UniProtKB/Swiss-Prot annotation, chain A:
The keyword Transmembrane helix does not apply. It comes from the Eukaryota. This is Proteasome subunit alpha type-7. Glycans are attached at residue 129. Changing residue 152 to F: Displays impaired G1/S transition and S/G2 progression. The modification N6-acetyllysine is found at residue 226. Phosphorylation by ABL1 or ABL2 leads to an inhibition of proteasomal activity and cell cycle transition blocks. CDD domains: proteasome_alpha_type_7. Its main location: cytoplasm. SMART domains: Proteasome_A_N.
From Swiss-Prot, chain D:
Component of the 20S core proteasome complex involved in the proteolytic degradation of most intracellular proteins. This complex plays numerous essential roles within the cell by associating with different regulatory particles. Associated with two 19S regulatory particles, forms the 26S proteasome and thus participates in the ATP-dependent degradation of ubiquitinated proteins. GO terms for molecular function: lipopolysaccharide binding. It comes from Homo sapiens. This is Proteasome subunit alpha type-1. The keyword Phosphoprotein applies. The 26S proteasome consists of a 20S proteasome core and two 19S regulatory subunits. The 20S proteasome core is a barrel-shaped complex made of 28 subunits that are arranged in four stacked rings. The two outer rings are each formed by seven alpha subunits, and the two inner rings are formed by seven beta subunits. The proteolytic activity is exerted by three beta-subunits PSMB5, PSMB6 and PSMB7. Interacts with NOTCH3. Interacts with ZFAND1.
UniProtKB/Swiss-Prot annotation, chain F:
It holds the Pfam family Proteasome. Signal peptide: none annotated. Belongs to the peptidase T1A family. Induction: Up-regulated in colon cancer cell lines. Up-regulated in fetal Down syndrome (DS) brain (at protein level). May be the target of the transcriptional activator NFE2L2. Glycans are attached at residue 185. It is found in: Cytoplasm; Nucleus. The modification Phosphoserine is found at residues 9, 49, 56. GO terms for biological process: proteasome-mediated ubiquitin-dependent protein catabolic process. GO terms for cellular component: cytoplasm; cytosol; extracellular exosome; extracellular region; ficolin-1-rich granule lumen; nucleoplasm; nucleus; proteasome complex. This is Proteasome subunit alpha type-5. Component of the 20S core proteasome complex involved in the proteolytic degradation of most intracellular proteins. This complex plays numerous essential roles within the cell by associating with different regulatory particles. Associated with two 19S regulatory particles, forms the 26S proteasome and thus participates in the ATP-dependent degradation of ubiquitinated proteins. It comes from Homo sapiens.
Curated annotation (Swiss-Prot), chain G:
One of its GO terms (cellular component) is P-body. This is Proteasome subunit alpha type-4. Pfam families: Proteasome, Proteasome_A_N. It comes from Homo sapiens (Human). Keywords: Acetylation, Cytoplasm, Host-virus interaction, Nucleus, Phosphoprotein, Proteasome. The modification Phosphoserine is found at residues 12, 74, 172. GO terms for biological process: proteasome-mediated ubiquitin-dependent protein catabolic process. Component of the 20S core proteasome complex involved in the proteolytic degradation of most intracellular proteins. This complex plays numerous essential roles within the cell by associating with different regulatory particles. Associated with two 19S regulatory particles, forms the 26S proteasome and thus participates in the ATP-dependent degradation of ubiquitinated proteins. It is found in: Cytoplasm; Nucleus. The 26S proteasome consists of a 20S proteasome core and two 19S regulatory subunits. The 20S proteasome core is a barrel-shaped complex made of 28 subunits that are arranged in four stacked rings. The two outer rings are each formed by seven alpha subunits, and the two inner rings are formed by seven beta subunits. The proteolytic activity is exerted by three beta-subunits PSMB5, PSMB6 and PSMB7. Induction: Down-regulated by antioxidants BO-653 and probucol. Belongs to the peptidase T1A family. The modification N6-acetyllysine is found at residues 126, 175.
């Protein structure tokens, strides 16, 4: 081991590494997510492929159990470690008590791991921030986010990655309980939020959902094209 | 020790007025062969307490070593505080219990005699950790044989003199010489007072055999 | 070869009164067909309202007594107050199961006052279970003493015999009667009797002799 | 000043400055006074408070049936050495079945604090011990230091502005050996009322007194059995 | 030693004897065997006193930890699983423990049976102990699912009476516990002699 | 790196403990008051977004059936402390059939408040308010990162605690009642907070000897707020 | 003792990472490799570092490491630093086979190696593996594959990969001359010959400076063809006849 | 010790490892050597000038066998050299325990280079300033393997390490060729070593070991004075 | 002890355990289930020491799902069978061995259906029809005269009936109810509970 603390306090009471390593998450890929009344919707942006290469392995949205869904930001490797760890953890919860794993339990695990990983002797803390979406107790739709400190924090919608202030400021107008709460309009208006990215190529959009009883479904850019077309149609109808 | 190789035999101790007399013999029999007929089975600890043991002699040597080390250590503290005899009794009891708990018994039967601060002391320590105080102790076959003499005279008279006690020990050792197969006509008497600790020499007994001229 | 246990015997009595816990025990320590002493009181006065008795293998009794005294001092030096009786009982149960796979060969009876100020006798077993009873007879003389207490304390198998609460002095003469009657037929009993009384004012002790054989 | 960093570094003048810093940190605790008779060892401390409403931080704490210690400095290291102290008492209480003589216990304490002043990676203990006990040769008033150069005295006084208290101890160390408990205790607070600025007076709630005697178990008192001790005084000669 | 438990429409009935001998010698007639784990769980003492006592106390501690971490009551099957996992680690080392885990679940009625041999199983009726077979006989005579409250009380009480009448290792008072949906309640504690006078004619 | 983990001062105490006492200050404020009728306790959640669901933010957690808590500053270090304190109270019950009293709880916490060590890790960055009901009635306890644990009658922590302690010393006395102390506490709350006071800002936690369970008030808090 | 610590893992004064970027720049000054899109088959290209005339060349592999029976890998960077990884990698694949008796499906292999690398990225505070390295291979679940490990532990499945400053322009040629559908190994070899003809400064491309190995599926086998020199020679003559075909436009 | 366990060798902004480059420079500031692989055998030859006339040439031996058929020389510092020699000895004997067969030189170089690579990365220790020249006649074809402090290795037809090793190398490239015998290799090796050494060169200044297919051989100063008495 | 049969077809695997959970005298539970649905085409049956059965099922059933989540697809029956054999063979030479008797029923896309057969000493077997327990002394010869490799599933269910009818005629145990599964190109389909009125 290394008898050296990375996490010494500041002269004025801060941590030079935790709130500082959040900036790695700030310099990462953007990913949003909301919970509807029955269907949950999330997705990442900035595929940024070489337009000749593969992307079925660069998938940033994964699952731990059949009921929970993942996301992250920052750098991908720490996310890979946390994901495999959490898969092992939720399957070991299945080895214990025979319920499907609640979202709150697995987020407590993730945040606790990250915290005691920051507390230990000379270890670089995980520069990620996950989004943990699931609906388990009678299908009650939830989503929690993490923090590199390890403070799980339950939301109703979320914005991370590059320019999340602008995304939450689009959400500012997009906070309506109406929002007319179809599944298609919720998905397409989350797609409008992700199309409020700083480049908005339209084709770099990667979105996937869950109907709170089914499993993960990856979409196709022709229904996304229809959603972009009807968004532009509503933008014409407002004029 | 599972198998005691070289055994001693019974030890006798009894209090009196301001002193405790302990006396055992000087025999090192192995099996039935009296292979070591000149050994000392009594350690004279520093100024007050005094030890006598039975069973395997090697374990007695070991405990003799460890106690000598500890007593020397407290004497090198240079503070003026020593061990009471009952403290030695406590430490030896905890030692024997710790040995038997780990399935490594120290095959012994030990007697601690000390005189400190007006009060006499005569302690007993078993192999199994059974430990108590008593006005007269008898180990081995002595608890069958010489124990009734002690309990007769101590019931008929609660306190004693040094001379009465010494003579009575001589009689008991004569009797143990009569009917014990692991006995020997050579013993030493060791006596503590407030004037210090003293080990007398290898004394012997006066026997009688006038029953043999009968058929 | 080496057998790690030996049976010393002994007799411990307890009677849960209304506002008193009487624990008495003989002071004969024996082994097989010999007599080691005629003074070894099985009782021990822990607090002002708790008395424990320990019979069986004597070395384990001593070791257990010292460990209980040590943990008493630890609780006091940590928590600024004495234990209750039931807390001591639970702690002893934890200890006796903490040496489950190399057991103590020791019977145990904790008497004493509760926090209300009433009698409370907590029986035990070698393996570490306990319960709150009104009387137990521990050691070698258990079967010689339990039915007489069933007749006298429990008023059981009797007809039209109303229930008077057991007074102090009547319980005292009961203990003296049962120890004489048990010392007649048992071999592991006699030569003294150490009678411990827990009141709301302290611990009283009392020594009454027996037959010397 | 660059050699003035760690415990391991010697000075080019030989005075390892970490121990000096630990001494000065011990000086910024609460004041305390310990003094013995031929038959009674009394230690008297002073409490402070964080604010008006809060209770006072306690100093005189129990150890064993014949040992009570005062304290000055940090409280975490205090409770750590308190745990070790109680442990070392009850260990010999288990084995030898006797209470410990005080001097060998304080030797164990000095040997305990020797290691974190000697290697690299530990600090000395900010600690302010005043130990009162009973071996067979009577009361003893020992003190320690973070350098573990423990002393035996007849009356010490460590903490804030304790030097005038030491002058009081000088001018009455002849008187101390003879008297009984009452005027002994009021000599003790006749040191502590000079550990305070003169524009205020020692009240009840801030003061605490621990007595052990050759037949007396060590007992702590606060305001109720200290109201008898606080009467029997006059004002200061203003 | 004779315990039984069966669930039905109105919850769970748990009754037991109170006799715990020692070899051929009765120690006490009033050994309270049904160990009250929680205000929503009830455990038993089936074979060995100390083992059942200790491990059920440890399970209670564990469940209270669980509830304090999740702000939520544990299930019955979860407690059975935890007890089985804890007991399984001392297999062959000489633990005798055949207890029963009862309680109300999010699913509702729950009745599990955990051995020191680790035979963790659910079920509808169970009976443990030496005279358990007698309880099996008279209970599976009288058992249904659609029983009433007083009917179930009489079934369990009659069962323990017959068991203590035939087998020798059982006797003493007959306790009687009743798990409802919200909490458990002690029904009564009846002596054998009273039942003998009542039911012999 | 500027005289770090294990170094005293030329004049005074340690560096990093002083930095921890500085690091408390950025946290959200909280006020506990001991009344003989029962301990009341309050906190401010400091909620930023309408997405930020209020009832998921924990400040008052529940140690035992009769022991509350309150925290400051950092979060998950306090969560680890809460976890271990719960485990130790349950162990105390397991080996004693009773309740680990509030002072014994806080001693079991402060025994490793300062066990920070990277060799042979960092000190914890949270100040804690403890409230419980022992056999000596109610108790209110205040600890710190430095382990210097004391009994407080009515402690105020965290941000703006200077004026909080001052104006709290203005109204307090020994013979207060419950509801008076509750409204007097939330007055100080809405004087030290910056937002309007409504149903989602604060949360109350009251423990009584007769009301041992449910050390909380849920949406009767709205009725309590509107009475000012 | 604590004034001898390096940075070893810590984030910047500005938000970035130190050893990771320096590991990438350690990669950049190494040999050049690439792999091609072939539906049946897959290939590797490699450049000879140290082409001095007094070597032996009796190892038959300077960059390639036939790691399973159905997988090899090229490599770029510090050599024995990578040889440690080859040893551990073959070990991990072989203990997979010990556990299942079915060959390794190669992506969990790649994640295993990446986790080995990442475990020295965060804690462990040692010199990180400044080696990126390729992957060719075949399976039952996707067929022929291509992968790109990085010292970060991030791994990308490409269809035409990337090595550093010597090969950034190669990837530019790969995009400007992207192919799709033609699984023909020989057109891919002509393509790779063209790529290394531009990128390497070896004038007129003598075959001693290069190294090519392929992996084709033969009837139950997936043999790994570390091909000899004469076919490379006639491949170069083929490519320079294609250069003559290119200058038919003059 | 404490077990501080961090490595001193980390990456530059250029991406280099300056301690390893310094260790290579420290190797290059060492004693010259020459090793030539002929058609049937391999010749090793070092250059050993004592500091005074007081030293003895019967105690320290540069040229060293690892098995009965594997020679090994170096150019660097003997205190590190003896360590890794002993390590290679134990390693080769572990191989001969497992397989009951003489270990091949490639396998030696794999394992030794892995150990040396491990010392380059592990905590706090300096790398070893030794450049080996390992060789042996395993299965007919003989081999010649140079290693380095960086943990890497190679395979040369002929090479040199030490003072003016580039000058010796440039003489080797013109003089040496692919096919000769052991005697001609000894001849050109003594030529290229005597190109760079001091003027007084005797039977004790040099130390020559050859590698027959009959095994490793370490020649005596008797046959050296037979040969190096004005070999051309 | 108890019973379970393992008949393979051309494109289906017909397994059938019992529902008996007795303890040495009495039948404590007469609807017990010994079936652990590992994957969408892989079943597992267990027989032996009932403290070991649940534990080893808890190991395998919660490790294969981990493989499923990590790799994004499903094991072969072959690799799963070998993995179980590996874990038994590692667990055998320890202070804590397992005494279980498994048989694994799988279905590949490529290999199609597959049956394996374990033993308490961890032996692999690729059997056409396996059994376990005491029943296995009769019910294999009741079967080995009417087996055809190209047999249809209704013939197979009929042969189960024909075999259970000869089981419950000359056998000291009770065994009243047998549960029956089947595997196909779709997955695990449960057939009806096969019990018998005897007389």
């Amino acid at each position: 081991s290394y008898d050296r603390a990375i996490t010494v306090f500041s002269p004025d009471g801060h941590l030079f590494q935790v709130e500082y390593a959040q900036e790695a998450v700030k310099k990462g890929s953007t990913a949003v997510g909301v919970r509807g009344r029955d269907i949950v919707v999330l997705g990442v942006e900035k595929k940024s492929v070489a337009k000749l290469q593969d992307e079925r392995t660069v998938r940033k949205i994964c699952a731990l159990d059949d009921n929970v869904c993942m996301a992250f930001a920052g750098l991908t490797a720490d996310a890979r470690i946390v994901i495999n760890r959490a898969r092992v953890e939720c399957q070991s919860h299945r080895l214990t008590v025979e319920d499907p794993v609640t979202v709150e339990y697995i987020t407590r695990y993730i945040a606790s791991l990250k915290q005691r990983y920051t507390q230990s002797n000379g270890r670089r803390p995980f520069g990620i921030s996950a989004l943990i979406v699931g609906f388990d107790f009678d299908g009650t739709p939830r989503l929690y986010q993490t923090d590199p400190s390890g403070t799980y924090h339950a939301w109703k919608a979320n914005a991370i990655g590059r320019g999340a202030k602008s995304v939450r400021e689009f959400l500012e107008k997009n906070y309506t309980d109406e929002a007319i709460e179809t599944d298609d309009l919720t998905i397409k208006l989350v797609i409008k939020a992700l199309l409020e990215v700083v480049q908005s190529g339209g084709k770099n959009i990667e979105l996937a959902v869950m109907r709170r009883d089914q499993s993960l479904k990856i979409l196709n850019p022709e229904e996304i094209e229809k959603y972009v077309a009807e968004i532009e149609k509503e933008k014409e109808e407002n004029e | 020790t599972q198998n005691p190789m070289v055994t001693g035999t019974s030890v006798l101790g009894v209090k009196f007025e301001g002193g405790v007399v302990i006396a055992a013999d000087m025999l090192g029999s192995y099996g039935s062969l009296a292979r070591f007929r000149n050994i000392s089975r009594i350690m004279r600890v520093n100024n007050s307490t005094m030890l006598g043991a039975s069973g395997d002699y090697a374990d007695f040597q070991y405990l003799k070593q460890v106690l000598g080390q500890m007593v020397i250590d407290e004497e090198l503290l240079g503070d003026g505080h020593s061990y009471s005899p009952r403290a030695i009794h406590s430490w030896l009891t905890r030692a024997m219990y710790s040995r038997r708990s780990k399935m490594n018994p120290l095959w012994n039967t030990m007697v601690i005699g000390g005189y400190a601060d007006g009060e006499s002391f005569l302690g007993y320590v078993d192999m199994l950790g059974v430990a108590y105080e008593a006005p007269s102790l008898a180990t081995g076959y002595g608890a069958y044989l010489a124990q009734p003499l002690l309990r007769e005279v101590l019931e008929k008279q609660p306190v004693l003199s040094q001379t009465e006690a010494r003579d009575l020990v001589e009689r008991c050792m004569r009797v143990l010489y009569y009917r014990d197969a692991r006995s020997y006509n050579r013993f030493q008497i060791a006596t503590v007072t407030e004037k210090g600790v003293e080990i007398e020499g290898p004394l012997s007994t006066e026997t009688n055999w006038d029953i043999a001229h009968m058929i | 070869r080496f057998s790690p246990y030996v049976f010393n015997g002994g007799t411990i009595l307890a009677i849960a009164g209304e506002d008193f816990a009487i624990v008495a025990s003989d002071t004969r320590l024996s082994e097989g067909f010999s007599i080691h002493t005629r003074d070894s009181p099985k009782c021990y006065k822990l607090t002002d309202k708790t008395v424990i008795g320990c019979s069986g293998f004597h070395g384990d009794c001593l070791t257990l007594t010292k460990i209980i005294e040590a943990r008493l001092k630890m609780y006091k030096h940590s928590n600024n107050k004495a234990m209750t009786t039931g807390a001591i009982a639970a702690m002893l149960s934890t200890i006796l199961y903490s040496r489950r796979f190399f057991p103590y060969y020791v019977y145990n009876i904790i008497g004493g006052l509760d926090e209300e100020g009433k009698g409370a006798v907590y029986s035990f077993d070698p393996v570490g279970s306990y319960q709150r009873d009104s009387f137990k007879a521990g050691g070698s003389a258990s079967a010689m003493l339990q039915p007489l207490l069933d007749n006298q304390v429990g008023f059981k198998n009797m007809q039209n015999v109303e229930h008077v609460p057991l007074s102090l002095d009547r319980a005292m003469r009961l203990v003296k009667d049962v120890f004489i009657s048990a010392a007649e037929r048992d071999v592991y009993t006699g030569d003294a009797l150490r009678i411990c009384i827990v009141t709301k004012e302290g611990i009283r002790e009392e020594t009454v002799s027996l037959r010397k054989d | 000043n660059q050699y003035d960093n760690d415990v391991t570094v010697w000075s080019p003048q030989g005075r390892i400055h970490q121990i000096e810093y630990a001494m000065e940190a011990v000086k910024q605790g609460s004041a305390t006074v310990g003094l013995k008779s031929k038959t009674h060892a009394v230690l008297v401390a002073l409490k402070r408070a964080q604010s008006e409403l809060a209770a006072h931080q306690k100093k005189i704490l129990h150890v064993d049936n014949h040992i009570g210690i005062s304290i000055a400095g940090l409280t975490a290291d205090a409770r750590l050495l308190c745990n070790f102290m109680r442990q070392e008492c009850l260990d010999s209480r288990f084995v030898f079945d006797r209470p410990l003589p005080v001097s060998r216990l304080v030797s164990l304490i000095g040997s305990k604090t020797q290691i974190p002043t000697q290697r690299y990676g530990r600090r000395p203990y900010g600690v302010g011990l005043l130990i009162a006990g009973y071996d067979d040769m009577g009361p003893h008033i020992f003190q320690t230091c973070p350098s573990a150069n423990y002393f035996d005295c007849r009356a010490m006084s460590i903490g804030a502005r304790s030097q005038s208290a030491r002058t009081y101890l000088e001018r009455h160390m002849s008187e101390f050996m003879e008297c009984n408990l009452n005027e002994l205790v009021k000599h003790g607070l006749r040191a502590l009322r000079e550990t305070l600025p003169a524009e205020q007076d020692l009240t009840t709630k801030n003061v605490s007194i621990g007595i052990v005697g050759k037949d007396l178990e060590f007992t702590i008192y606060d305001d109720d059995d200290v109201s008898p001790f606080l009467e029997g005084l006059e004002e200061r000669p203003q | 030693t004779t315990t039984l438990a069966f669930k039905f429409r109105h919850g769970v009935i748990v009754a037991a004897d109170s006799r715990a001998t020692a070899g051929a010698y009765i120690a006490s007639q009033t050994v309270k065997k049904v160990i009250e784990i929680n205000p929503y769980l009830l455990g038993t003492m089936a074979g060995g006193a100390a083992d059942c006592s200790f491990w059920e106390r440890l399970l209670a501690r564990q469940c209270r930890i669980y509830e304090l971490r999740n702000k939520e009551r544990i299930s019955v099957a979860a407690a059975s699983k935890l007890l089985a996992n804890m007991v399984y680690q001392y297999k062959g080392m000489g633990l005798s423990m055949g207890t029963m885990i009862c309680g109300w679940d999010k699913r509702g009625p729950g009745l599990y049976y955990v051995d020191s041999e680790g035979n963790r199983i659910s079920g509808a009726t169970f009976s443990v102990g030496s005279g358990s077979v007698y309880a099996y006989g008279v209970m599976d005579r009288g058992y249904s699912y659609d029983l009433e409250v007083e009917q179930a009380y009489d079934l369990a009480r009659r069962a323990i009476y017959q068991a203590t009448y035939r087998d020798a290792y059982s006797g003493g008072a007959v306790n009687l516990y009743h798990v409802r949906e919200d909490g458990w309640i002690r029904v009564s504690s009846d002596n054998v002699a009273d039942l003998h006078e009542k039911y012999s004619g | 790196y500027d005289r770090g983990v294990n170094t005293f001062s030329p004049e005074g105490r340690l560096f990093q403990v002083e930095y921890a006492i500085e690091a408390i200050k950025l946290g959200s404020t909280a006020i506990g008051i001991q009344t003989s009728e029962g301990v009341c306790l309050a906190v401010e959640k400091r909620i930023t977004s309408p997405l930020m669901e209020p009832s998921s933010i924990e400040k008052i957690v529940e140690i035992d059936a009769h022991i509350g808590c309150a925290m400051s500053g950092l979060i998950a270090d306090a969560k680890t402390l809460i976890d271990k304190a719960r485990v130790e109270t349950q162990n105390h019950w397991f080996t004693y059939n009773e309740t680990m009293t509030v002072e014994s709880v806080t001693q079991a916490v402060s025994n490793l408040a300062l066990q920070f060590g990277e060799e042979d890790s960092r000190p914890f960055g949270v100040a804690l308010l403890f409230g419980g009901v022992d056999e000596k009635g109610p108790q209110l306890f205040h600890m710190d990162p430095s382990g210097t644990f004391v009994q407080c009658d009515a402690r105020a922590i965290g941000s703006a605690s200077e004026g909080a302690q001052s104006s709290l010393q203005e109204v307090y006395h020994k013979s207060m009642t419950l509801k008076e102390a509750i409204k007097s506490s939330l007055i100080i709350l809405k004087q030290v907070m910056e937002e309007k006071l409504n149903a989602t800002n604060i949360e109350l936690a009251t423990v009584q000897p007769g009301q041992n369970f449910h050390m909380f008030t849920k949406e009767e808090l709205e009725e309590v707020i509107k009475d000012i | 003792s604590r004034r001898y610590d390096s940075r070893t893992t810590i984030f910047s004064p500005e938000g970035r990472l130190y050893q990771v970027e320096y590991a990438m720049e350690a990669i950049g000054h190494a040999g050049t490799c690439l792999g091609i899109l072939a539906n049946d088959g897959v290939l590797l290209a490699a450049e000879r570092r140290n082409i001095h005339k007094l070597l032996d060349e009796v190892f038959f592999s300077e960059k390639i490491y036939k790691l399973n029976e159905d997988m090899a890998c090229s490599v770029a960077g510090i050599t024995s630093d990578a040889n440690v990884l080859t040893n551990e990698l073959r070990l991990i694949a072989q203990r997979y086979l010990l556990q299942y008796q079915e060959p390794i499906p190669c992506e969990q292999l790649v994640t295993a190696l990446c986790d080995i690398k990442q475990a020295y990225t965060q804690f462990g505070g040692k010199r990180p593996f400044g080696v990126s390295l390729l992957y060719i291979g075949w399976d039952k679940h996707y067929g022929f594959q291509l992968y790109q490990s990085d010292p970060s532990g991030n791994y990308g499945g490409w269809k035409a990969t990337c090595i550093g400053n010597n090969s950034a322009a190669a990837v530019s040629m790969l995009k400007q001359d992207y192919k799709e559908g033609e699984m023909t190994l020989k057109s891919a070899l002509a393509l790779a010959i063209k790529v290394l003809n531009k990128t390497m400064d070896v004038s007129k491309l003598s075959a001693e400076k290069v190294e090519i190995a392929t992996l084709t599926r033969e009837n139950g086998k997936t043999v790994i063809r570390v091909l000899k020199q004469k076919e490379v020679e006639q491949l170069i003559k083929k490519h320079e006849e294609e250069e003559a075909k290119a200058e038919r436009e003059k | 010790e404490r077990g501080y366990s961090f490595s001193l060798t980390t990456f530059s902004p250029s991406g280099k490892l300056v301690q390893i480059e310094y260790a290579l420079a420290a190797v290059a500031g060492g004693a010259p050597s020459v090793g030539i692989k002929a058609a049937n055998g391999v010749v090793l030859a070092t250059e050993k000038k004592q500091k005074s006339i007081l030293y003895d040439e019967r105690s320290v031996h540069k040229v060293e066998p690892i098995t009965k058929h594997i020679g090994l020389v170096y150019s660097g510092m003997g205190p590190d050299y003896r360590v890794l020699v002993h390590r290679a000895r134990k390693l080769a004997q572990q191989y001969y325990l497992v397989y009951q067969e003489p270990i091949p030189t490639a396998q030696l170089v794999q394992r030794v280079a892995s150990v040396m690579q491990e010392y380059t990365q592990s905590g706090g220790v300096r790398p070893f300033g030794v450049s080996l020249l390992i060789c042996g006649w395993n299965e007919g074809r003989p081999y010649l393997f140079q290693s380095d402090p960086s943990g890497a290795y190679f395979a040369w037809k002929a090479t040199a390490m030490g003072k003016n090793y580039v000058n010796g190398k440039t003489f080797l490239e013109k003089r040496y060729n692919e096919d000769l015998e052991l005697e001609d290799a000894i001849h050109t090796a003594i030529l290229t070593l005597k190109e760079s050494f001091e003027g007084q060169m005797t039977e004790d200044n040099i130390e020559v070991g050859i590698c027959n297919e009959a095994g490793f051989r370490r020649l005596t100063p008797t046959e050296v004075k037979d040969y190096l008495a004005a070999i051309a | 002890m108890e019973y379970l049969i393992g008949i393979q077809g051309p494109d289906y695997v017909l397994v059938a355990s019992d529902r008996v959970a007795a303890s040495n005298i009495v039948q404590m539970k007469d609807d017990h289930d010994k079936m652990f649905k590992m994957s969408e085409k892989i079943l597992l049956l267990c027989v032996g020491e009932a403290g070991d059965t649940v534990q080893f099922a808890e190991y395998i059933q919660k490790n294969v799902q981990l493989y499923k989540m990590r790799n994004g697809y499903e094991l072969s029956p072959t690799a799963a069978a070998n993995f179980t054999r590996r874990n038994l063979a590692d667990c055998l030479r320890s202070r804590t061995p397992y005494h279980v008797n498994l048989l694994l029923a799988g279905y590949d896309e490529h290999e199609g259906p597959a049956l394996y057969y374990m033993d308490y000493l961890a032996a692999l077997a690729k059997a056409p029809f396996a059994a376990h327990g005491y029943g296995a002394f009769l019910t294999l010869s009741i079967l080995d005269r009417y087996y055809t490799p190209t047999i249809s599933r209704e013939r197979a269910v009929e042969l189960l009936r024909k075999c259970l009818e000869e089981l419950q005629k000359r056998f000291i145990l009770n065994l009243p109810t047998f549960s029956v599964r089947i595997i196909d190109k779709n997955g695990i389909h449960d057939l009806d509970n096969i019990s018998f009125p005897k007389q």
